[PDB]
Design a binder for this molecule. Structure first.
Ligand code: ATP
Ligand code: ATP
Ligand code: ATP
Ligand code: ATP
Ligand code: ATP
Ligand code: ATP
Ligand code: MG
Ligand code: MG
Ligand code: MG
Ligand code: MG
Ligand code: MG
Ligand code: MG
Lengths: 458, 460, 458
């Protein structure tokens, strides 16, 4: 069974090539899931890429509203209709002939019907829909062209369609969802079945942007600096270019301090760096940075640093990934920083969060970008948190900052927890922050049980 | 697709400009969600901000009741009668004509219909509803005017409309909710879809006030330092706190959080500065006594119109309501610094999602108006450090003042330490402090003591 | 919009004045929720207070049963009907006229219809109810008098009414619930909406008594004694008159011993004290008390002590509050004692329990009553329990009793954990119980980690 490329970032890989050619695919989903955007994008790409004439049979919506609505993604369907590339037919076998005729009249290969559930209210009786639904499908496959039928849904986790019979008639079934968990929406796509072919099972996180749908389905020995010389000595000559570093520690340990020095070092070597803030504001970050002896304002003036401040609770994880990607695709940094991951995990699912980290890490490694992500531990024992963290198994380097109470004084300690394919210092060296940055000193030799955060004289 | 500024506090940002031009927006919700209120506000602002002629089509309620109902928000009906900028049509295509007629009879632009679910009593079939709903939105778009059709729902988490078909006919869908979790209602508005445009997905906390709906959508940083009330505490923070900064004092029950809040507010009024104290644990009567027992006359500071106390039981109103109160109270008095006693009193019997959205708002607004916020929180463990790390609101704060009990020689002594100070140097020593009739007396730290963070140290 | 006072303890504050005048309020709820009791109480109060003639339109019930049923709250509707103050009309616009006529014939201002859901079985068809329901409402508001319509419900957390359309017709909606959680009923009232006015949102705990419905929506420096001189020295001269004391400790620490001495001290100063027991029985309490050297039997003979023994598992929290209040309103004590709160929290919700403590504390402070509540900790570390307790943040004084194992002997220790707006001793003094009460001795000076319950020689 040949598959027809839809040129939809993700769907191509999820459908193992695309949609079965000569057959009809059903895209069911609730209101605002993006059933019309998909059907349009399936046609547009078809004419904008392989130049394969395509017809869109409208119903509840008009040929003007569709074009005007398609303008949101910067598309000109009028020019596509002015060149006879696309045909929008306004709207019981009078339609089947009109489509069969129009298709042959414009030598069409890709058709989209949005929606059939609209023109079935006068029928109902469940079995009535089926018989009329089956006839259409047969009248399509007989013509020999591939389509993507649109169907309405009531529940996100209920019947496939409205009459729960359209799925058994259609050859391929794609379900568009928009689940609401914790007052936060999430668009997920899934291929229920693909008769006479293979596909990726389960749901995949997607978003809607000006580009349209965005379904989200080497190892060089080159070392880079972190901004701190002592830390580079502890990492056996700084981090790797194509590596993921992780700074985990208690609140106010110095995660943001290390990120500031990591971003500065990029801009100091005339290299672009993107800082994704989710805890502090640009105003505060600029002040805090300057207090340590770093002019972030200057770094933005040299077009070598871009601060992307935003609230984690605002947008969803799926959207946050689309932002970093787009922002990374535009500025094209040498190294990025996420401050922090703990701010993006609160009020989120462990499953939906794991997929975020995989994407950011994978993309960062795919574009050969040195990513330094931070994370605030939920326990006073940093080691316990790092071991309890499922994102710590994915990171290549782990910088652990731990509070150590010594002589009734809350001192701080830093240690390179792990360093993949590179020697690192295994000593828990103490450090003190000043008006110039970190000052990594010696490691507590005459103390025991320092991992608890409260050592004892040996 | 041109938008239409509804002038609704929040919706403008949530809708990325407002509602699509010459398009039909559906506002579904249960009874008491505020569909009619929203519908009135939409038109009201239209002919009181941009002079936009709009008509309100009624069905269940009459032109007098509606006009009388808007009297709770101080809105007169002189715009619909004397002025003639409004039009209340008392109440299948017999009405559509009148809508268009009146529209062109005042060069219309904004329309509001409440409710369209009530004009389908005769018809019980969903198919019929769609057909009539479809032709309505069709004509409307043909005329070219911003319509805000209002429908009703049965479940807060179920069908979009009563017949679950109106959402597919309408171009835009807005769902007003009023969820009840733990015998407490929560009004949340959400934009389901906006055909041919972008918007904020998911539901946003809103409240209904005398000004109507109050939707709450989700470089300064000066180095100017302010005093906390305690001299030694200012020396421990490297010259007092920051002006536009959030401070948090966590500790076991009876550690001295309220004592620190009392000096923070006193110091304000001492420099002829206004300070609002938000109480949620003790009452004014009690607070005045304890305050005076520490050597502070809060009654005096209230007499100088410099201090205000807003006592209220947490377990009564919703977090969104508390947020609306603080804002309004801060917008009225306009203080230099505020105090919340406490965040733990407002966290009990609330969701971590709903509670984190609160602190973000208060912190955000406090910093957005350059107000020094001293928030407190009673720790649920005897190891204060554990609780601070466990706290997902401890990362949000700029300064953290940790108070913790320390058993020494079979005596329950207390210790204070500046856990962290964002973009500032602070003392890293756990100095013991005592409380008396003059207030806190920060002493020295414990040199020959180990495992002090445990609450029960050992002689070194 | 003017509001009409219903003289219902609570509703006045929950409705911010009362019910919208010239409009109709809908009181929906299940069977036994108290829809008829409310409607009657709305009329009675109207004639017994502002003397505003009122008419009750009955249906399934008769004008005799209603009066006989109203006798339970000690009301004489016959005398109200014998004076032409109330009119009970026995029982499709023949009724609207009968009401419109009768109302004007008796110059009525308050009307009650129980129930409309009864006279709608022959109609049904959902939309039919609406049209007939809307007509009634319009025929009422036109007359210009305020009402409280009664409607039946199926589920406690489901449709507002039976046809789920009455809520959209009515101007104001009040829902009476009777939720069953853990084989225990709880009556909650709520104002869904109030068109053209403000109200308290969410549900409020209410009960039914002989008084009818019972919706439940200074700081002097005067010090009082606890019965123990050493404890008064540790509290800087005893507790405050308008203060809440809390005795938290492990089972058999001496909570009941301290409560006995606290109640005795009241009766010793010719002051009335109420002891609310929930763990031990009067028989046992009398014996235990006498064993320490206190004649509680004598204290009851002097009309200075009243023991209110009851089982927590019997009645609900809402009811327990109504008892203390009524019992406090009758005897009018100087100081009360709850033994204990831990007995009233088992098999209850943390939310429904927090509201109980607020009420008892608030009322105790409103009537200037010194309340000493006890609580049995669920851990061996008293400090951990006090910190973990959400009721410990509301109490003004916290007396912590902790078991301390010394020299293979289970000794006991007492300490004033906190004392609001008063100096207190910060020493963990040991104590031993004898045949005369508590003997607070010195504090363990040569021991460390005593808070664990198992110290160590220093
Ligand atoms: N340019 C854009 N930028 C951002 N978001 C957009 C943009 N255009 C559309 N959207 C979002 O994506 C959605 C796409 O709606 P679409 O018309 O595809 O809905 P549908 O699934 O066909 O629904 P219906 O059942 O009403 O036909 C919009 O409702 C909006 O939330
Ligand atoms: N100018 C300064 N001089 C000395 N120490 C400073 C200075 N500025 C900040 N610090 C120290 O740095 C700490 C904050 O570091 P940073 O904000 O990087 O920590 P973090 O762990 O990233 O914080 P958060 O918990 O907010 O994410 C402060 O608590 C303080 O102890
Ligand atoms: N001044 C006010 N202060 C506080 N709350 C108010 C005020 N005015 C109105 N409200 C609240 O807002 C509600 C307004 O009801 P509204 O008419 O907006 O409801 P609706 O969603 O249109 O209901 P319906 O199902 O009858 O159409 C009141 O019930 C009340 O809860
Ligand atoms: N006049 C006083 N003299 C001495 N100590 C006092 C005096 N007033 C209060 N205290 C001390 O202060 C404690 C209460 O301080 P404060 O109320 O500020 O603490 P908190 O942490 O806010 O407690 P809560 O858990 O009640 O909110 C008392 O337990 C006592 O130790
Ligand atoms: N004097 C009383 N003392 C205690 N409880 C009482 C007393 N009188 C009534 N009750 C309780 O309150 C309830 C009040 O019943 P009421 O007649 O108000 O029911 P209703 O909600 O109108 O129900 P229905 O749907 O049957 O009309 C009684 O069923 C009983 O449980
Ligand atoms: N006559 C007595 N002489 C000495 N000790 C006594 C005497 N009577 C009781 N006790 C001590 O008092 C303890 C009980 O005290 P009390 O009943 O007040 O404790 P409690 O903590 O309130 O109990 P509960 O856990 O049942 O609530 C007994 O375990 C015993 O050790
Ligand atoms: Mg569509
Ligand atoms: Mg940080
Ligand atoms: Mg309405
Ligand atoms: Mg306090
Ligand atoms: Mg009844
Ligand atoms: Mg006892």
């Amino acid at each position: 069974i040949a598959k027809m490329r839809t040129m939809i970032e993700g769907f191509d890989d999820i459908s193992h090539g695309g949609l079965p050619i000569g057959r009809s695919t059903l895209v069911s989903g609730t209101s605002g899931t993006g059933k019309t955007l998909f059907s349009i994008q399936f046609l547009y790409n078809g004419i904008i890429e392989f130049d394969e004439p395509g017809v869109f049979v409208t119903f509840e919506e008009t040929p003007q509203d569709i074009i005007k609505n398609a303008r949101s993604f910067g598309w000109d369907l009028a020019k596509l209709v002015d060149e006879g590339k696309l045909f929008i037919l306004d709207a019981l076998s009078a339609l089947i002939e009109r489509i069969n005729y129009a298709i042959q009249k414009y030598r069409a290969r890709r058709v989209s019907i949005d929606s059939v559930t609209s023109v079935f209210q006068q029928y109902d009786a469940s079995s009535v829909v089926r018989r009329e639904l089956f006839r259409l499908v047969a009248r399509l496959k007989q013509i020999g062209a591939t389509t993507v039928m649109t169907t309405e849904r009531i529940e996100e986790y209920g019947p496939i369609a409205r009459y729960g019979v359209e799925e058994f008639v259609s050859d391929n079934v794609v379900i568009l969802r928009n689940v609401l968990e914790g007052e936060r929406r999430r668009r997920t796509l899934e291929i229920l079945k693909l008769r006479g072919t293979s596909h990726m099972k389960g749901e995949y996180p997607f978003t809607i942007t000006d580009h349209g749908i965005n379904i989200f389905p080497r190892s060089s020995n080159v070392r880079v600096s972190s901004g701190v010389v002592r830390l580079d000595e502890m990492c056996g000559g700084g981090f790797f270019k194509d590596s993921i570093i992780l700074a985990t520690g208690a609140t106010g340990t110095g995660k943001t301090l290390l990120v500031s020095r990591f971003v500065e070092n990029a801009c100091a070597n005339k290299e672009r760096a993107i800082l994704f803030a989710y805890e502090e504001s640009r105003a505060q970050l600029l002040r805090n940075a300057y207090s340590w002896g770093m002019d972030f304002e200057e770094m933005e003036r040299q077009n070598l640093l871009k601060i992307v401040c935003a609230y984690p609770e605002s947008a969803g994880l799926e959207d946050h990934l689309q932002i970093i990607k787009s922002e990374i695709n535009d500025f094209k940094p040498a190294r990025i920083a996420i401050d922090s991951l703990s701010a993006l995990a609160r009020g989120v699912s462990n499953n939906a969060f794991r997929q975020f980290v995989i994407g950011v890490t994978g993309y960062a490694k795919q574009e050969e970008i040195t990513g330094l992500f931070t994370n605030t531990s939920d326990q006073w024992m940093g080691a316990h948190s790092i071991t309890d963290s499922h994102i710590s198994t994915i990171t290549d380097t782990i910088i652990l900052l731990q509070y150590v109470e010594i002589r009734g004084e809350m001192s701080r300690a830093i240690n390179v927890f792990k360093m993949r394919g590179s020697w690192h210092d295994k000593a828990i060296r103490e450090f003190m922050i000043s008006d110039k940055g970190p000052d990594i000193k010696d490691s507590f030799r005459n103390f025991e049980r320092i991992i608890s955060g409260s050592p004892t004289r040996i």
